[PDB]
Amino acid sequence: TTWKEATLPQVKAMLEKDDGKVSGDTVTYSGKTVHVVAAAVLPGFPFPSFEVHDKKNPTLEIPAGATVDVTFINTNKGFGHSFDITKKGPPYAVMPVIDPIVAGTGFSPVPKDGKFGYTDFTWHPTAGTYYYVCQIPGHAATGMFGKIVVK
Numbered sequence: 001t002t003w004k005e006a007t008l009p010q011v012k013a014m015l016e017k018d019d020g021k022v023s024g025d026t027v028t029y030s031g032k033t034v035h036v037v038a039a040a041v042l043p044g045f046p047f048p049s050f051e052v053h054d055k056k057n058p059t060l061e062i063p064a065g066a067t068v069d070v071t072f073i074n075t076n077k078g079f080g081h082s083f084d085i086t087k088k089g090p091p092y093a094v095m096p097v098i099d100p101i102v103a104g105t106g107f108s109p110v111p112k113d114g115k116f117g118y119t120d121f122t123w124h125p126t127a128g129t130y131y132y133v134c135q136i137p138g139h140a141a142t143g144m145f146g147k148i149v150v151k
């Protein structure tokens with residue numbers, strides 16, 4: 001996919017653009033268009049994991065019919081995590097069999113020269129349960145995934 005580069009202050013600014021509301025380990029979105037901003041292993045969080053709205057691998061609740069704008073930022077030095085959406089649930093093998101990927105980013109570039117790679121994609125899901133996972137061998141198997149409920 002097409003990756004762009006952002007400086008640290010830029011990363012901070014984007015993270016706060018997630019318009020979901022957190023409740024426990026759940027982030028609920030509302031409206032015609034929703035904006036999900038996910039990051040791979042923010043400093044201080046467990047490895048390996050995804051952070052959405054400052055929460056570790058939270059369950060995302062999206063209204064059916066809404067246009068989902070996803071922004072994925074890889075803030076983890078040394079690894080090129082991915083954010084791929086599939087219908088296949090856990091447990092995941094070391095080499096996850098999650099085809100077909102409904103929407104996703106593919107492997108991201110590793111942080112370099114004081115910048116972090118990020119990308120944006122749109123998704124118009126049908127009601128159902130999906131999962132966002134990282135395809136780097138072993139990551140999903142060690143907990144790098146979360147659930148998406150479209151209802």
Ligand SMILES: [Cu+2]
Nearest residue numbers: 081134136139
């Ligand atoms: Cu990963």
